[PDB]
Symmetry: C2
Subunit: 641 residues, 2 copies
């Protein structure tokens, strides 16, 4: 039973979509009810007129009513058209099995940058949404990145529904400023980072208002643990997908966004009242650089200005880690050395803040020149209170909704450990790439030095033979020619000077040392790394995700309580295999760095050897030229008689 009004065909569901099968425009018409109250009818007309004014790109825009659609209207009031977004609401993205513990870093950054710049324009036109939920935010597939648009607006005074995203001012029905949106944003952001609602997970608003009035402004997360004890924590809970500076700045911003007093909410102590837009813009504009210290295997995030010198940031890293700037070795994904004075902010040269943020490529690995071998242990990863409490007793039959949370946290921890292993493996591979480059250069220099040494040997033999024949023939002209002991001594002096030289033995020593070095280099070049070797960790991650999906597949009638023995077993197995693999990674890393140092030790040996053999060849040529000059001068003088 499908009905159309021309070319536009009706689609399924407040707002209903109409797709054109000849022009191709999917316009969403919002239908109005038939029984309207006078004040509500006037407000509906006001909303109709207001929608034509707002045309922000980061929010859904109002489109023209098709010609001939007012005729098929039961009520005398015009329905409004909109743009259909193929993406869908943010709620489905949040409920995905991969984003159970919050979205990726890039997704959160794009969400903030797309929502704040639209909310500023909404507040500029004296329009307040007064309601904001993940269901209103749709992820429209843009030209380059996904754009966060806002559908299904509400009401507003010119300057009542059903949902759990309520600000306290909606409960008190008191004089509210625009800050009611800010709060509704902040809570949302929390579930976008950690995965759960910040204030009272699935608790009724009745005690929620009291527990919000009781909490201090610094405490951001209000939750009860496995026992059932209320807790107010000021720090951002784990496990989030953010780095250090991101977590700290966003925790301060969240404290600035979650306040009880309406006029004090959003009041930034730097950008005046309601200056959260500029604070968030300053947070987003911060060029963060990730450095992976391989000695301890720790990731450090640093905020770098547009023109912060490389040496100053290296000094900051030296102060933090403890390795001086001289012994610092900064390497890229393929054994690429960083620019030695132009700032290393080119490590994110793409600079398009990819929606699928990949902090495993935009990081720079740091190695030490002083240490010869590296340690295997890099310490494990921290775990939240619930995860530790369920690890101490895996046989705790907790509720279904608590088990969902803790199992998701365990799966996220396993995936994080796998990612850390991949990053360390990539760092060692990059070190090997740099070593291979140096080895190729040293092989070319070895060939050049061997060529020079053999040429010198040939020239010495030829010169010695020539001078020996000259000395033999000199004694046969002494009977009737012109004889002297003046220039006879010069030939003997050169005869001793040729014996003074000769670097064949040192060259041979260097050749066997270089040959041994290259053979061990190729011996550890054979070792494969790219294809994750003993890829047990990925299969363990697959088991964890399969178990998590199986838990979320049982219908509501099978949602029974049980123990978490199997997932704890999987986590312990993953930890053991992770350390076992990291041990081999660091063994190969030490094997690589020792040979790199040996190559850099053998470089100046050959440098000085060739710099000496060059002058040796020069002297040989000079001696031959002088002997020929002496003979020609003697002939010229004798021809005068």
């Amino acid at each position: 039973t499908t009905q159309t009004c021309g070319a536009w065909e009706m689609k399924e569901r407040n707002v209903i979509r109409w797709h054109n099968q000849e022009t191709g425009e999917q316009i969403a018409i919002k239908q109005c009810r038939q029984e309207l109250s006078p004040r509500n009818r006037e407000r509906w007309c006001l909303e109709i007129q207001i929608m034509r004014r707002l045309t922000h790109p980061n929010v859904v825009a109002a489109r023209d009513v098709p010609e001939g659609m007012q005729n098929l209207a039961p009520n005398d009031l015009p329905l409004l058209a909109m743009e259909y977004c193929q993406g869908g609401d943010l709620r489905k993205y949040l409920n995905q099995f991969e984003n159970c513990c919050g979205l990726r870093e890039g997704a959160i950054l794009t969400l903030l940058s797309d929502i704040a710049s639209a909310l500023r324009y909404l507040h500029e036109n004296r329009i307040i949404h007064r309601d904001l939920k993940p269901e209103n935010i749709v992820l429209q597939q843009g030209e380059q990145r996904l754009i966060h648009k806002i559908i299904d607006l509400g009401y507003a005074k010119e300057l009542v529904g059903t949902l759990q995203y309520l600000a306290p001012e909606l409960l008190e029905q008191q004089k509210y400023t625009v800050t009611v949106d800010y709060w509704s944003f902040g809570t949302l952001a929390f579930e976008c980072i950690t995965g759960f609602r910040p204030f009272l997970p699935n608790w009724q608003p009745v005690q929620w208002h009291s527990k919000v009035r009781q909490k201090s402004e610094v405490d951001i997360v209000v939750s009860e643990d496995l026992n059932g004890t209320v807790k107010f924590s000021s720090s951002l809970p784990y496990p989030n997908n953010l780095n250090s500076v991101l977590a700290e700045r966003l925790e301060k911003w969240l404290q600035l966004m979650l306040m009880w007093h309406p006029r004090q909410r959003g009041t930034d102590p730097t950008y005046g009242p309601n200056g959260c837009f500029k604070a968030l813009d300053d947070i987003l504009n911060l060029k963060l650089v990730h450095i992976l210290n391989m000695v301890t295997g720790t990731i450090h995030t640093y905020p770098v200005t547009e023109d912060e010198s490389l040496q100053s940031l290296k000094a900051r890293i030296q102060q933090d880690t403890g390795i001086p700037e001289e012994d610092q070795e900064l390497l890229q994904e393929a054994g690429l050395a960083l620019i030695p004075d132009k700032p290393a902010t080119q490590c994110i040269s793409d600079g398009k803040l990819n929606e699928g943020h990949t902090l495993d490529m935009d990081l720079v690995f740091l190695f030490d020149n002083s240490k010869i071998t590296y340690e295997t242990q890099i310490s494990p990863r921290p775990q939240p209170e619930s995860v530790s409490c369920i690890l101490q007793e895996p046989k705790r039959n907790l509720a279904f909704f608590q088990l969902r949370k803790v199992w998701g946290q365990v799966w996220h921890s396993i995936q994080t450990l796998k990612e850390d292993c991949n990053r360390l493996q990539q760092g060692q591979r990059a070190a090997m790439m740099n070593l291979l480059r140096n080895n190729s250069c040293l092989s070319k220099m070895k060939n050049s030095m061997a060529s020079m040494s053999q040429q010198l040997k040939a020239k010495l033999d030829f010169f010695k033979t020539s001078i020996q024949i000259d000395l033999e023939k000199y004694s046969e002209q002494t009977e009737f020619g012109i004889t002297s002991d003046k220039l006879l001594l010069a030939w003997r002096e050169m005869e001793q000077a040729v014996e003074l030289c000769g670097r064949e033995n040192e060259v041979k020593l260097l050749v066997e040392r270089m040959m041994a070095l290259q053979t061990d280099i190729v011996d550890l070049q054979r070792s494969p790394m790219g294809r994750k070797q003993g890829g047990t960790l990925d299969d363990l991650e697959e088991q964890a995700r399969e178990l998590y999906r199986r838990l979320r597949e049982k219908p509501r009638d099978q949602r029974t309580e049980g123990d978490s023995q199997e997932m704890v077993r999987l986590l312990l197995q993953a930890i053991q295999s992770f350390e076992k693999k990291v041990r081999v990674i660091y063994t190969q890393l030490s094997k690589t760095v020792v040979c790199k140092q040996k190559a850099l030790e053998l470089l100046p040996k050959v440098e000085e050897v060739v710099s000496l053999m060059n002058e040796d060849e020069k002297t040989v040529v000079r001696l031959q030229e002088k002997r020929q000059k002496e003979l020609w001068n003697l002939l010229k003088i004798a021809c005068s008689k």
Copy 2:
């Protein structure tokens, strides 16, 4: 209740009882006599005691003295006799092992034959016949180097398969009663099952042995239940070609119905099976694995068979001429002519899979990805065509064991092929190292030649420049400017830097090709996964053989058929890569042998080039010397 008396304490068994000494540590086996015996049996037991006391052959258990003070502890009024305890155990347990379900290994059967025949001949020499022989009487005593088969009723002149028909039909049996009793035994040592009538009653057994022809050796019923008399040695045996054929002929000579015809060899007269089996054992068999077809051929080589004659026979059989034949060992060692083909050296440090020699062809450039699969017996094929056949437990045991043995054989063949490829790679690597050394030598010679040419041209350029000043003052006779200009124009001709560069690039490409797939094969193998599949099958096969008689139900064989098909697919998949690498290896070996004489002739020419440069320099120096000396001494 007579637990111990002195140092010798009884331990366990109930005909013979073991007695261990608490001071010497010797386990003596005493054969005790019971009390209710008939008198004629009493005189015969005393006679057997004395007869056992005289015989002391090494391949049979020997009699040791009864210790002093044992006559008091005797249940019978006549002295009992002692024997030697063997720690090894009976042959029956070795036959019932899960690894020897389809017969013993080749070496085990050879040792069993060589240890039983040399003792049975001495037993027959003293007019003593055992009249009974079963695997329970044969113990595998741990010898000094190899295991020795010793033996722990007799008249002096389930329990019937190892008994000859002349004794079980209550007929007068001659020494052939042992011979038949041996022939059956060896059969279960090769195939795994009893030769004559599996699970048949002795009543009809006599008739079914009378019905079979003398050539038919195996009498068995298939899955349906139809009696069959096959003359060829059944599969899967652990023997090679000539071993299987010659032992089949010997089994036909050993399994005959007529008493006078049994053991009658048409070469060594009647009852000359000992020397015929010795001739079979003395045959030096050499195994050659043709890699083009991937087939194993066994050849019997006499004491003085020429290498070229055997190569001609292999050429006639396989089809590769003697010139194109490449005989290689496990580590790339060539069969050096013309020392005898001693590579099958069992006397060395040291299984027919180690003394094997691989055969390669020079004519063929690339080898095929498939060498065809292996044949399978009729029962295996019949159970593969229908895996859902619920057959009896004792038939399922046989077919499942045969399937497991076939899987193991495929794994062994894969190992043989991989070892052959690795040996070819080793042979190629030796030549590659030699060619790298020659490359370095040639580069050194070329650089020396370049340096000498530069030195010579510099010197002659300076000499020509100084020649002009002398051509203006009177002492200049242009009778030798020709030599100077000829030297200048002639030394420029030498120099093959471009040819040397081409040869170096080709040699470098060859070396890179050598190292390209050097680390693709190794001692480890992806075939391990197939072995893991094989392991699963054997474990499943053994586990089902543990269920007691109340759970011994009939079922289907779907899982083992699936495992066999998976193993076959992976076997072919691995063989494809093996032969790909083999073709790459042979082509690179041919490329190295092609690039060798190029550098040989190049260096043989550069040597004379260097000689000519030296001669020209010496001539210039002599010329200038002579001119100056004569011109200056003319004035004086």
